């Protein structure tokens, strides 16, 4: 199916997609053609937001359908690497540690299962939330890579 996407600047573009393509994959195609990074993309269709996990078929998107890029209150935190590199993330108090490691992956290319996160001298568990650790605005987390070998 061939769909339409209208950018924030009003430009209209066509995309050759398939019903099974996920929304995350759509944003990747928008970047390949127009250059907008996926982290800046917020897509809507018929007045409903699209999450990276669904597919076009779920939102009954078909040929000639039009998706609109729109502007997005997120909490800013920092993740410092062993060498002192500072990573800036946008998070919510309900986000789990696994979600934060997924955000680190999108910026550093490191799989979540290869990351350790430390806050207040404590290692953070993947299933718990940021609120469980009292991680607030401007808090700084520490990233230590695993990547073990022998």
């Amino acid at each position: 199916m061939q769909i339409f996407v209208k950018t924030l600047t009003g430009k209209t573009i066509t995309l050759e997609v398939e019903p099974s393509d996920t929304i995350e994959n759509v944003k990747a195609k928008i970047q390949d053609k127009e250059g907008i990074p996926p982290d800046q993309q917020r897509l809507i269709f018929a007045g409903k937001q699209l999450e990276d996990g669904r597919t076009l078929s779920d939102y009954n998107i078909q040929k000639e359908s039009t998706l609109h890029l729109v502007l997005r209150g997120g909490m800013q935190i920092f993740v410092k690497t062993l060498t002192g590199k500072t990573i800036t993330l946008e998070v919510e108090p309900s986000d789990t540690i696994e979600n934060v490691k997924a955000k680190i992956q999108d910026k550093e290319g490191i799989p979540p299962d290869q990351q350790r996160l430390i806050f207040a001298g404590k290692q953070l568990e993947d299933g718990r939330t940021l609120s469980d650790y009292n991680i607030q605005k401007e808090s700084t987390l520490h990233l230590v890579l695993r990547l073990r070998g022998g």
Binding site: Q2, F4, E16, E18, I44, F45, V70
Partner: protein, 240 residues
Amino acid sequence: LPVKERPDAIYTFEGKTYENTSFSKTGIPIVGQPLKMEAYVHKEYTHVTSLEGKRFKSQLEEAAKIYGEQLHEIQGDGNALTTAFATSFLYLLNGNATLIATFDNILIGLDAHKNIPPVRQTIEKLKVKNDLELKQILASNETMFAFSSVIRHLARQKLPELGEPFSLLIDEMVPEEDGKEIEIACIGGLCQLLNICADVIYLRKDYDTFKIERYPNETGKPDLVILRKAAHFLSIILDS
């Protein structure tokens, strides 16, 4: 279908107005003008970064290396398979009176269809090789839509006569309703009926190289070259 989903619809979302577009408003023709592959790649993959896009880009450039430097974009109205076939078929019909007569004889035998008379009038204009008339034919959205719908109707009526798998899967493979996608096997059946050869270029996102589906025999010189870019078909202008 719901109002908010329809083309050309206007709605509001979080205090801002949005207007869905359409093929008629964007002016995208049924069959685009001749376009060099390198220009098409720059259009679709100017900021390519994803693995799927890099593979499609390199496979598109390899296809042009093998078959021809130019192609026709095809409107994704759901009939792109039959529209791309009609485009490639018209290049073969240009100046080929014997093939035009065989095609006209098939059209006469088909059940009634509103677009059959205009298609017969069209192929009559190509008995003598005329590149300029072909250009005007391909530039007419109404002419090419008629051609595209006649190929669908033709496939549904004649392919079941070839036997299996067409007798068993015709409705799933080539739906009657306009705008409903068609399976690739339809091209293979059409080549068998018309006694022509086609190469279908299956762009693969899971592999570094494309896959060539050649009909009716895995050997032979292709008369048509159709490219499948996701669930969409384009027509390559075959160079000699």
